[PDB]
């Protein structure tokens with residue numbers, strides 16, 4: 001493709017920063033799904049999801065952002081929200097249609113990310129929306145295989161034993 | 164496997 005303009009770079013920054021007023025000014029049908037070419041090809045939505053910019057996420061979803069957009073590793077925004085623990089964001093994405101069992105290039109799901117990163121409430125959320133805890137990544141590992149021993153709440157959750 | 168963008 002033809003790359004980014006300065007205005008596109010300004011939009012990616014505003015999305016990561018939570019500068020919602022700037023995002024409103026810069027987001028066009030042509031820019032809303034631009035990619036961060038010099039990073040890992042994150043879209044505005046990837047950034048806003050990863051950095052917990054809930055107002056930005058809301059705006060982007062309402063103005064044509066692609067919930068399914070893949071970064072260089074095949075991560076979709078829901079992966080980013082789950083990795084970094086951002087529950088409201090994850091819920092928003094799921095409400096708009098995010099695929100809860102989506103796999104990146106390494107067959108990691110959002111539940112693998114949440115498990116590995118010790119995010120109990122995210123794991124519970126994903127489970128409440130149909131996440132399959134038996135899915136194996138390219139290493140043969142389930143989400144449970146990625147849970148630290150100190151996260152016994154998550155271990156119980158994924159075994160079937162949580163309140 | 165490289166990290167997605169974000170913080171938390």
Ligand SMILES: *CCCn1cc(CCCCCc2cn(CCC*)nn2)nn1
Pocket residue numbers: 164165166167169170171
């Ligand atoms: C795939 C992970 C890449 N990664 C993470 C680290 C640990 C250092 C990261 C810096 C921590 C950081 C980021 N922010 C922004 C606010 C969430 N603040 N501190 N190394 N490699």
Ligand SMILES: [Cl-]
Pocket residue numbers: 018019020052053054055056057
């Ligand atoms: Cl925000």
